[PDB]
Design a protein around this ligand. Sequence first.
Ligand SMILES: CC(=O)N[C@@H]1[C@@H](O[C@@H]2O[C@H](CO)[C@H](O)[C@H](O)[C@H]2O)[C@H](O)[C@@H](CO)O[C@H]1O
Ligand SMILES: [Cl-]
Length: 147
Amino acid sequence: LQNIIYNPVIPFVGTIPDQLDPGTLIVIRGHVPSDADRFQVDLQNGSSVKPRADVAFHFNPRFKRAGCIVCNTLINEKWGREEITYDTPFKREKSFEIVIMVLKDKFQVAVNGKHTLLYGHRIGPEKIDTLGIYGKVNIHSIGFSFS
Ligand SMILES: CC(=O)N[C@@H]1[C@@H](O[C@@H]2O[C@H](CO)[C@H](O)[C@H](O)[C@H]2O)[C@H](O)[C@@H](CO)O[C@H]1O
Ligand SMILES: [Cl-]
C-alpha cells in the first residue's frame, strides 16, 4: 500500500493523496471498542467544518443490538435517502479490515475479506479529496492503492 498512515488520532481528517479513479483502494484496519455506539468513514469534498463539507460516501457502522451499516450522501448540509445494510460483520471488541474500492459507477466495500455492500455514486468521485474517520473506533492503519 501507498501513503500509509499509522495509529492516527480520531477524529482523523486527511487529504487523499491522489485521484479516486476506478480501481483505487482505500484500506482501513482497526478495532471497535467495547462501548461503541457508532463510527463513520466519510469520503468528502474538502474539509470545511462550517459549512460542513459535502460527503460523497458516508459509511456508518452502528452497533445497538444486531447493528447495521447506514450509507448516505450529504450535499449542501442535507442528507439524502439512507441505504441500510443489516447484514453487518462489525462487532464490539473485534478488529476489522475495510477495503473500499472505487468503481466507475459505485463504491464496493469488502470487510474482513468478504463482500459487504455496494454504494452508487451520487457525487462525481473526482470531486472527493478527503478521508474523514469519526466516532468510537480505533484505527491501526490507513493505506491507499492507486494506479
Ligand atoms: C439529524 C438526525 O438526527 N437524523 C436522523 C438519522 O441520523 C443521521 O443519519 C445520518 C446518515 O443518514 C448520519 O449518520 C448522522 O450522523 C445521523 O445523525 C437517522 O439515521 C434517521 C433514522 O434512521 O432519522 C434521522 O432523523
Ligand atoms: Cl445494544
